[PDB]
Amino acid sequence: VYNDGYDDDNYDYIVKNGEKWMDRYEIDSLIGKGSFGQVVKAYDRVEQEWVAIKIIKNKKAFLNQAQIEVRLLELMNKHDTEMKYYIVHLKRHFMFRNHLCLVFEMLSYNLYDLLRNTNFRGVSLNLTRKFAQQMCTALLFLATPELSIIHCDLKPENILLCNPKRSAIKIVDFGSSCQLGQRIYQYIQSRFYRSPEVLLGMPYDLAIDMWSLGCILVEMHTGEPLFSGANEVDQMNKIVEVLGIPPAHILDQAPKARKFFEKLPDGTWNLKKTKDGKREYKPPGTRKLHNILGVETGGPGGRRAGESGHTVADYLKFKDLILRMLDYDPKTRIQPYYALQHSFFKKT
Numbered sequence: 001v002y003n004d005g006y007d008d009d010n011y012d013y014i015v016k017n018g019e020k021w022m023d024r025y026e027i028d029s030l031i032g033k034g035s036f037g038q039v040v041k042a043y044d045r046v047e048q049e050w051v052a053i054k055i056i057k058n059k060k061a062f063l064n065q066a067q068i069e070v071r072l073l074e075l076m077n078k079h080d081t082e083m084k085y086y087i088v089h090l091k092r093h094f095m096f097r098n099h100l101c102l103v104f105e106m107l108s109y110n111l112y113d114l115l116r117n118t119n120f121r122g123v124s125l126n127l128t129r130k131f132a133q134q135m136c137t138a139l140l141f142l143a144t145p146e147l148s149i150i151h152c153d154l155k156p157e158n159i160l161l162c163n164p165k166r167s168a169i170k171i172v173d174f175g176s177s178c179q180l181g182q183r184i185y186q187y188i189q190s191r192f193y194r195s196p197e198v199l200l201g202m203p204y205d206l207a208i209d210m211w212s213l214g215c216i217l218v219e220m221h222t223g224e225p226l227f228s229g230a231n232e233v234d235q236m237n238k239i240v241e242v243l244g245i246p247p248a249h250i251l252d253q254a255p256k257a258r259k260f261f262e263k264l265p266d267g268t269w270n271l272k273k274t275k276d277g278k279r280e281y282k283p284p285g286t287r288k289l290h291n292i293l294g295v296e297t298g299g300p301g302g303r304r305a306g307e308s309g310h311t312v313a314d315y316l317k318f319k320d321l322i323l324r325m326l327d328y329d330p331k332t333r334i335q336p337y338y339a340l341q342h343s344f345f346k347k348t
């Protein structure tokens with residue numbers, strides 16, 4: 001009784017392996033899932049190649065958001081004719097059985113799959129550097145004035161390997177992306193990767209992606225999310241454990257500062273007071289990235305002790321870049337052009 005029997009109760013297309021669409025696509029299987037709908041692997045008979053097909057939910061709000069996604073993908077792909085800025089390619093789109101379907105090149109698995117494959121030991125610092133450099137080049141591309149595109153949902157799951165053994169990547173899922181000055185949501189980004197200005201209800205720009213990236217890079221090396229909040233209050237407190245209380249010039253303009261913080265008569269800010277007898281977080285800024293990363297103790301959890309490509313100097317450079325990506329102030333947070341110039345990327 002949903003979509004004349006083609007949909008489940010959650011607006012998704014009921015995927016059947018081997019179904020052929022439009023005398024062109026043979027549906028192999030489901031390969032991904034999301035809030036947007038589903039992704040399937042299919043073979044395009046006409047072009048005689050494998051593709052991934054993202055099936056948007058048969059639901060107006062989701063259709064209308066995916067129309068924005070289509071426009072940003074076609075816009076990016078036309079400024080990336082050489083396909084060298086690490087953004088997935090929208091081959092074409094169509095309506096089928098009342099689902100917007102977007103056809104992409106077939107890609108390998110994502111960076112989360114890669115971490116899980118190491119049993120969350122984390123990938124090497126050399127491989128992290130390759131990912132960071134590609135990622136920064138991609139954000140530089142997004143920042144070109146004709147695009148000014150904010151991805152808004154960078155996470156390990158939305159960065160895909162081109163090929164499962166090689167290190168080339170592409171960013172996918174511009175399903176919540178917007179352009180500078182075309183911002184339409186306040187609840188954005190995945191929580192672990194969510195920036196302070198978004199937690200604070202403040203206006204945001206492309207710099208929220210660089211925040212997400214700094215979280216991602218740490219997690220790729222340690223194996224675990226840097227700020228693993230269960231809800232927004234716990235997310236902001238986890239950030240404060242590592243970075244301290246946010247500067248007053250930020251909190252004074254934050255419409256949601258009172259959700260997490262409290263201003264004292266002298267105008268300084270602290271965390272909201274907790275119920276008497278309840279200790280739950282480390283005191284502000286005492287959980288140091290220096291120790292999260294194991295800079296002088298053999299890498300995260302000491303697991304890198306004795307390996308090449310993991311020197312103390314290597315780690316200090318890494319930490320510095322990460323901390324610059326995690327600047328509380330969006331206006332001084334490091335920007336893609338300067339991140340590429342960081343000493344973490346030199347040499348070899």
Ligand SMILES: Brc1cnc2[nH]nnc2c1
Pocket residue numbers: 032039052054088104105106107172173174
């Ligand atoms: Br290829 C590919 C795979 N997964 C995606 N999610 N959103 N866009 C995507 C493109």
Ligand SMILES: Brc1cnc2[nH]nnc2c1
Pocket residue numbers: 242243244285287288289290291319323
């Ligand atoms: Br803020 C901040 C957080 N963690 C650190 N580790 N080493 N220096 C640091 C500065």
Ligand SMILES: [Cl-]
Pocket residue numbers: 033034035036
């Ligand atoms: Cl999702």
Ligand SMILES: [Cl-]
Pocket residue numbers: 124126127309
């Ligand atoms: Cl290596």
Ligand SMILES: [Cl-]
Pocket residue numbers: 228238
């Ligand atoms: Cl924690």
